[PDB]
RNA sequence: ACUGAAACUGUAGUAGAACCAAUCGGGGUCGUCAAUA
């Protein structure tokens, strides 16, 4: 058989256009979005930090709300019951 | 003379080891102060 497209679209989710919009040019304020956190790896025999294994990591501030458009392009022939199927 | 489809930048990884909030100090003891007549 042909493989079958998806039925769904999902677009990126990306933060609130207003909440974008104030963003514009702040620069300062884009990388403040994000934050180092630390991170190490200890020896397991001497619970110390091992050679190499230290890194820091951009994370983003939990809260934040994204939304992607979605499209869901079913089958012009395709039943009430498996429309519900597709939903559930 | 016709949009390729489908695919998580993810997986493993302790910001940790070492480091004395500490060193010295009798709750003690005597003559000063003012300038003239």
Same mark, same amino acid.
């Given at each position: 058989?042909? %493989?079958?497209? +998806?039925?769904? !679209? =999902?677009?990126?989710?990306?933060?609130?256009?207003? /909440?974008?919009?104030?963003?514009?040019?702040?620069?300062?304020?884009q990388?403040?979005?994000?934050?180092?956190? %630390?991170?190490? +790896?200890?020896? !397991? =025999?001497?619970?110390?930090?091992?050679?190499?294994? /230290?890194?820091?990591?951009?994370?983003?501030?939990?809260?934040?709300?994204?939304?992607?458009?979605?499209?869901?392009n079913?089958?012009?022939?395709?039943?009430?019951?498996?429309?519900?199927?597709?939903?559930?």
């Open positions: 058989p042909e %493989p079958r497209p +998806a039925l769904i !679209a =999902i677009g990126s989710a990306h933060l609130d256009p207003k /909440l974008k919009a104030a963003f514009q040019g702040k620069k300062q304020l990388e403040a979005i994000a934050f180092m956190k %630390p991170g190490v +790896a200890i020896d !397991a =025999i001497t619970g110390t930090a091992k050679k190499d294994f /230290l890194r820091f990591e951009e994370v983003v501030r939990l809260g934040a709300k994204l939304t992607a458009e979605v499209e869901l079913l089958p012009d022939n395709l039943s009430e019951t498996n429309k519900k199927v597709i939903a559930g």
